[PDB]
Amino acid sequence: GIYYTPKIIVDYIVKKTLKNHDIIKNPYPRILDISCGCGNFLLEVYDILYDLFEENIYELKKKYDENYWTVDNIHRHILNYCIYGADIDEKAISILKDSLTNKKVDESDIKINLFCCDSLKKKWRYKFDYIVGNPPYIGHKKLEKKYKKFLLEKYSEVYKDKADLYFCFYKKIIDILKQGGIGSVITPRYFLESLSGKDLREYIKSNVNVQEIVDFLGANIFKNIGVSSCILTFDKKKTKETYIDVFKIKNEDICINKFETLEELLKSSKFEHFNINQRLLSDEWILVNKDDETFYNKIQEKCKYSLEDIAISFQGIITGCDKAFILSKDDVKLNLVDDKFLKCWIKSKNINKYIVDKSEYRLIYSNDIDNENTNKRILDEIIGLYKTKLENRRECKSGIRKWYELQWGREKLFFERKKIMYPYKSNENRFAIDYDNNFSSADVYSFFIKEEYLDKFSYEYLVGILNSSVYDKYFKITAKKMSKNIYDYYPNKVMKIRIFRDNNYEEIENLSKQIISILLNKSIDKGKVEKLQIKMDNLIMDSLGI
DNA sequence: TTCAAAAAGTCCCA
DNA sequence: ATGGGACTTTTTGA
Ligand SMILES: Nc1ccc(CCCNc2ncnc3c2ncn3[C@@H]2O[C@H](CO)[C@@H](O)[C@H]2O)cc1
Ligand SMILES: [K+]
Ligand SMILES: [K+]
């Protein structure tokens, strides 16, 4: 449970918080890491501090106690008054204490401000000038329930339904930062856009001045770790300035060690830089450049409806154990199941633009099985193979669901109708019209048009514009970037997409119908579809004035 | 009763 | 062995 931050990032963070420190004015800075681990950040802080003190040793000796300020006394001073670390791992603290002791190589048995504790529970007796480090990331599934009760009761300003632990670490760091202090940390990027991060974003916006956001997007910073990172730097300084420097990466395939320093990478063509006014932040943080801001605002102003206005959205089936209820359509065991119980089953990869692949799987809609005696063959020879796993589901332990029932079988009538489907995680917009009453898991989302908006919007028109290049860019501006070439397509953002209706409605609809007709051929002339899409994109750009 | 969010993702191969 | 690519379950709070 210990993660090594790359040295280039560690150096950038420490330098970010200490480059302009006035050691003459304040020779007693407090630099804290509340998840210090083996001291990836703190040892570097020691190096920076030692150079800072030794470069001004004679100035300090003249302004202050001349006997206290010598080179020989630097190592002691740093440990007594400057470096502070906290971590839950005892072995890590022991190792870091030995490393800090070996920075000099007893005289008086120097005390080192290292605490082996839960930083979210520690009674912190004073605030700190500088806070750096890499907090732990633990999500809603992997966090202990008993501990989650404490977080919900005590960190309710940032920790709620599906929040993450590092939300609480952000709140703690902000709370124990001195007036005029500086904090710089590396966390997941997901709180910048996620629905769970709304309270955290409000807290950060309204309690600190955000200096800088480095967004690495899908680039893999931590080797062999599936997480997407960002660096946040904030302060509590009295300033009328309220502008943020945003560095957003341009090529996610870059390796982090191209130059000797991260700042060389940030100044290069690998990153784009722009400024965001913190006072103009809403509940969402729309961090885009002026071209994209103009693009987004044009679209928002022009469109008079949203998908939420005109549609009904729902998440797919959650069986609770897929292997028990999902079978290949050529499985011999499917001869045991009456066709009234069987539904077509698709995965996210089966969703293309405008149409769905033919399904290869069948769902046993076991909610329609009455009792265990009439269909004993289905239960004993198909579903019962996983009975233990099925009995451990939450709604079975509580007794709400029978052991063979789907955990969340939703409502059949919602699926057995003409509707639009899209994958929950994709590199591009893929909205299809489903004609075959397809069921799917939560990896696919569905919506259908309300009855009162059918005369205004058709499924063909909607899949026309939603699959356009304009709308790919428009959705990705505010979407949640998960990993390299993966965006979240969830209703909490998909339903916010704004749509329009003007003189180009009929031609866009006709082009969409032609695309759908071609895609459903035996001899698919795939080429002409691209030409038709280009023409449709021209129509949409004409419609939205871009 | 029953919705929808959640990557320190998961798994595989060259 | 690692780094990169294809693909995506069900646990969980509200
Ligand atoms: N059972 C159990 C339940 C909940 C928790 C959460 C406790 C949160 N409070 C914590 N307080 C201090 N340090 C913590 C910490 N959680 C993780 N670390 C350290 O962060 C580094 C980055 O990974 C590593 O060196 C971890 O050892 C911990 C255990
Ligand atoms: K003096
Ligand atoms: K990543």
Distance A115 CA to C9 C1' (A): 39
For A380, the token pair is 């004993």
Distance CA A92, CA A415 (A): 53
What is the residue with the minimal CA distance to atom 13 of ligand 1? A87
Q: Is A249 helix (H, G, I), strand (E, B) or coil?
A: strand
DSSP A421-476: EEESEESS---EEE-S--EE-TTEEEEEE-GGGTTT--HHHHHHHHTSHHHHHHHH
Residues A532 and A511: beta-carbon distance below 8 Å: yes
Give the neighbor-by-neighbor strand order of the sheet with A486-488.
A425-426, A486-488, A480-483
Burial of A445 (0-12, 13-18, 19+ CB in 10 A): buried
Which ligand is nearest the CA of A66, by number?
A: 2
Q: How far is CA A173 from CA A127, A209, A234, in A?
A: 9, 14, 11
Ligand sitting nearest the alpha carbon of A135? 1
Tell how far the Cα of A83 is from the centroid of ligand 2, in angstroms.
25
- List Cβ neighbours of A127 (8 Å cut-off, separation of 6 or more): A30, A176, A177, A178, A181
- A66 CA distance to ligand 1 middle (Å): 42
At A99, list the tokens: 């490393």
Q: What is the DSSP string of A500-522?
A: --STTHHHHHHHHHHHHHHHTSS
CA distance A64 to A428: 63
A52 CB-near residues (< 8 Å, 6+ apart): A18, A21, A23
- Phi-psi map region of A180: left, alpha, beta (phi>0 left; psi -120 to 50 alpha): left
Give me ligand 1 centre to Cα A88, in Å: 5
Helix/strand/coil for A31: strand
Q: Does a structural domain hold residue A246? A: no
Domain end: A117, A134, A151, which one? Answer: A134
Whether A437 is in a domain gets the answer: yes
A451 vs A448: CA distance, rounded Å: 9
Q: How far is the CA of A379 from the centre of ligand 2 (A)?
A: 88
User: How far does the CA of A347 sit from the C1' of B13, in Å?
Assistant: 23
Residues with a beta carbon under 5 angstroms from ion ligand 3: A 218, 220, 228, 483
Domain boundary among A134, A149, A179: A134
Number of domains in chain A: 2
Please give the full DSSP string across A332-372, using - where no structure is assigned.
GGGGGS-GGGEEEEE-GGGB-SBSBPPP-EEEE-GGG---T
Q: A341 CB under 6 A from ligand 1?
A: no
Please list the residues that pair with A182 across neighbouring strands.
Answer: A130, A235
- Is residue A4 in contact with ligand 1, taking CB distance under 6 Å? no
* A119 CB near ligand 1 (under 6 Å): yes
**Crossing angle (nearest 10°) for helices A505-519 and A459-466:** 90
Q: Which residue is nearest to nucleotide C6 (CA to C1')?
A: A349
Q: Is residue A302 situated within a structural domain?
A: no
Look at residue A130 and tell me if it is in a domain: yes
A73 in a structural domain: yes
Bridge partners of A186, per DSSP, are A231
Instruction: Point out the ligand nearest to the CA of residue A256.
Output: 3
Q: A238 in helix, strand or coil?
A: coil
Expressed as residue numbers, the domain containing A441 is: 309-544
- Ligand 1, atom 17, lies closest to the CA of A136
List residues, by chain if needed, whose CB lies under 5 Å from ion ligand 2.
Answer: A 66
Residue showing tokens 């591009």 = A428
Contacts of A368 (CB under 8 A, 6+ apart): A340, A341
- Domain end position, chosen among A79, A111, A134: A134
Distance in angstroms: CA A495, C1' C13: 21
Q: How far is it, in rounded angstroms, from Cα A175 to Cα A208?
A: 10
Tokens representing A308?
């939420």
Contact between residue A543 and residue A535 where contact means Cβ atoms under 8 Å apart: no
Specify the 3-state DSSP secondary structure of A230: strand
The secondary structure of chain A in percent helix, strand, coil, rounded to multiples of 5, reads 40, 20, 40
Structure token digits, residue A540:
């949409």
Q: What number of CA atoms fall less than 13 Å from residue A22's CA on the CB side?
A: 5
3-state SS of A141-208 is CCCCHHHHHHHHHHCCCCCCCCCCHHHHHHHHHHHCEEEEEEEEEEEECHHHCCHHHHHHHHHHHHHC
Name the residue among A294, A254, A259 with its Cα closest to residue A274.
A294
Place of tokens 């929040």: A163
Q: State which residue has its Cα closest to the C1' atom of B9.
A: A226
For residue A495, the Cα-to-chain-centroid distance in whole angstroms is 18
Nucleotides of C under 7 A from a protein CB: 2-14
Nearest to A73 by CA among A104, A39, A97, A95: A104
Cα–Cα distance, A362 to A432 (Å, whole number): 20
The CATH number of residue A72's host domain is: 3.40.50.150
**Residue length, chain A?**
546
For residues A365, A369, A373, A378, the Cα torsion angle rounded to the nearest 10 degrees is -10
Tell the residue nearest (CA) to atom 11 of ligand 1.
Answer: A118
Does A466 map to a domain?
Answer: yes
Q: If DSSP codes are grouped into helix, strand and coil, which group holds residue A108?
A: coil
- A232 within a domain of the structure (yes/no): no
For ligand 1, whether the C-beta of A35 sits within 6 Å is yes
Q: How were these coordinates obtained?
A: X-ray
Are residues A45 and A131 in contact, defined by beta-carbon separation less than 8 angstroms? no
Q: How far is A532 from A514, CA to CA, in rounded Å?
A: 8
SS (H, E, C) A277-341: EHHHCCCCCCCCCHHHHHHHHHHHHHCCEEHHHHEEEEECCECCCHHHHEEECCCHHHHHCCHHH
| Identity of residue A122 | K
Beta-bridge partner residues of A83: A31
Whether A302 and A499 have beta carbons less than 8 Å apart is answered as no
User: Would you say residue A289 lies in a domain?
Assistant: no
